[PDB]
Amino acid sequence: KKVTWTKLSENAYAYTAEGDPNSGVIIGDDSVLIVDTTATPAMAQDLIAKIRSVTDKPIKHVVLSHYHAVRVLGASAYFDEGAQHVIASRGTYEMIVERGEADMKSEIERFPRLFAGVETVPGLTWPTLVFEREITLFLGKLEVKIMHVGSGHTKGDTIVWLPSQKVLFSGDLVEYDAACYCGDAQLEQWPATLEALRALGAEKLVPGRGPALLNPAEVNKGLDYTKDFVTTLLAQGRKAVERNLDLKAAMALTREAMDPKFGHVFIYEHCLPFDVSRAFDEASGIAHPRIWTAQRDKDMWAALQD
């Protein structure tokens, strides 16, 4: 299992594991902050190990970039390492309340291998600190901004921004070598959210998965790609709705435009059915995402195949 621990700047690191989402790490004067937890407390052990190869400081703050189980269910591992708060936006908190249980069951059923040692998961991760717009932590002298600048990947998407070093942890708002999972997306709002991230002027950006982007040209390529992906996806959904297509026809129409431009990115085929399904709903006027459950997955595959 290939693990990559990348020092991005004086105080910022990215943690990547083959096939897993990225986690972000900020080492402040007094304490460590992480962005997303890895999928289980058993998997969190190796992120802790990487952090402890650098510092003995308490892992005081655990930020959830959004509510999805793979991002949050490792949170309880960090208590013994010094966690004082699990931080989430109001939107993320609302999603945990509304569909945390359903999403936990859904994600573990879909991709059990993402949840190594799933028996170590104690239950849902409940934030202890919920913010509306923006909080700033001073880790000694190090300023860390935790911000909701708009929704996209989910209602409540949260970013972590290190202004002094221009390091942005985008959660799943930004991708580059992988497709966007849009099953819970607010597709209409995502382009404006991407432009808000562009206005930050990041020199380093940790995307949802894959290697970090290490200069502004790479940052903007990731922003442009993600914007193109989610704009095209929603546009094809509006076309399917205008034409009264069923889901199989909507998938074929979406592929017309998405496959040439994006068909090469990692996990494209895994994500595309959920993306077409969400785009069709949202274009149909379902602004708040339907909840994904096993029976909805089953009906989706049935509609797409036979």
**By Cβ distance, which residue is nearest to Zn ion?**
68
Helix spans in 245-289 (H): 247-262, 268-283
Q: Give the separation between CA 114 and CA 108, rounded to whole angstroms.
A: 8
Name which position in 57, 60, 61, 68 contacts Zn ion (CB under 5 A).
Answer: 68
- Residue 209 engages Zn ion in binding (rule: CB under 5 A): no
Q: Does the footprint of Cl ion cover residue 131 (CB under 5 A)?
A: yes
- Per partner kind, with CB cut-offs from 5 to 8 A, the member of Cl ion, Zn ion, none near residue 243 is none
Does 36 sit near Zn ion (CB under 5 A)?
A: no
Residue 264 partner contact from Zn ion, Cl ion, none using kind-dependent CB cut-offs of 5 to 8 Å: none
Q: Say if residues 70 and 21 touch (Cβ distance below 8 Å).
A: yes
Neighbours of 151 (CB within 10 A): 22
> Which tokens in the block code for residue 216?
């502004």
Q: Which does 126 bind (CB under 5 to 8 A by kind): Zn ion, Cl ion, none?
A: none
Q: Which is nearer to Cl ion, 127 or 210 (CB)?
A: 127
- Of 62-70, 78-86, 135-143, 282-290, the window that binds Zn ion (rule: CB under 5 A) is 62-70
Separation CA 283–CA 297 (nearest Å): 19
Q: Does 306 bind Cl ion (CB under 5 A)?
A: no
Question: Is residue 246 annotated as involved in ligand binding?
Answer: no
Distance, CA of 270 to chain centre: 16
Q: What are phi and psi for residue 37, nearest 5 degrees?
A: -105, -5
How far, in whole angstroms, is CA 245 from its chain's centroid? 30
- Tell me the residue type at 101: E
Binding site partner of 133, from Zn ion, Cl ion, none, Cβ cut-off 5-8 A by kind: Cl ion
Task: Output the DSSP codes for 207-228.
Answer: -SSSSPB-SHHHHHHHHHHHHH
Report the C-alpha gap between 188 and 190 in whole angstroms: 6
What number of residues does the chain have?
306
Q: Is 153 annotated as a binding residue?
A: yes
Which one of Cl ion, Zn ion, none interacts with residue 172, CB within 5 to 8 A by kind? Zn ion
Among 7, 52, 133, 243, binds Cl ion (CB under 5 A): 133
Q: Is 172 annotated as a binding residue?
A: yes
264 is in an annotated binding site: no
What minimum distance in Å lies between the beta carbon of 90 and Cl ion?
9
Is residue 57 involved in binding Zn ion (CB under 5 A)? Answer: no
Question: Residues 169 to 208: which contact Zn ion by CB under 5 A?
Answer: 172
Partner touching 268 among Cl ion, Zn ion, none, CB below 5 to 8 Å by kind: none
Helices 268-283 and 294-305: crossing angle in degrees, nearest 10, is 100
The residue within the footprint of Cl ion, chosen from 56, 132, 242, 306 (CB under 5 A), is 132
What is the contact surface with Cl ion in residues (CB under 5 A)? Answer: 131-133, 296
Interface residues toward Zn ion, by CB under 5 A = 68, 172
